[PDB]
Amino acid sequence: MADPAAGEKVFGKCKACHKLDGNDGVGPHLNGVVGRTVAGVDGFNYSDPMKAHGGDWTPEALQEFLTNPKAVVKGTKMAFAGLPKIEDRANLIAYLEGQQ
Ligand code: HEC
């Protein structure tokens, strides 16, 4: 279910750490994330297992990482448990494709 207006509501879990208006605080800026390199913001202090993992943030890699982030990148500083429903993951990834 690729819906950006419902994905803004699921981004309610992300907005307390991650900033869409080009800014890097507790988490980095999620405006321009789909297709971006893993640890690829020169500006945010990333953990060493995020730099040693590598690749780029595709829809398949994002739905695995938003299911459990400390199981996929083993030793990331992201304190988030998971999005369990496929519907909520497809809604939020459609909003990350709008904020691209
Ligand atoms: C604060 C408690 C966070 C919440 C809630 C969410 N994330 Fe986060 N995110 C946070 C940190 C501290 C980090 C950096 C981890 C590191 O290895 O240094 C991140 C990282 C992500 C990333 C990777 C970003 C990139 O490399 O460009 C993604 C894709 C990410 N987080 C996505 C995301 C989403 C969509 C969330 C809401 C469901 C979410 N994060 C919550 C901190 C926190």
Q: Where are the domains of the chain?
A: 1-100
Q: Which two tokens stand for residue 81?
A: 């448990």
Decide: 88 and 95 in contact? Cβ < 8 Å: no
94 lines ligand 1 (CB under 6 A): no
How many angstroms is it from 41 CA to the middle of ligand 1? 13
Q: 93 φ, ψ to 5°? A: -60, -40
C-alpha 87/C-alpha 66 separation (Å) is: 12
Q: Which CATH superfamily is domain 1-100 in?
A: Cytochrome c-like domain (1.10.760.10)
68 lines ligand 1 (CB under 6 A): no
Where helices occur in 1-100 by DSSP H, the ranges are: 4-10, 48-53, 59-67, 69-72, 86-98
Q: Which atom of ligand 1 is nearest to the CA of 62?
A: 29
Q: Which residues contact 87 (CB under 8 A, 6 or more apart)?
A: 1
Tallying the residues shown for the chain, one arrives at: 100
How many angstroms is it from 98 CA to the middle of ligand 1? 18
Elucidation method: NMR
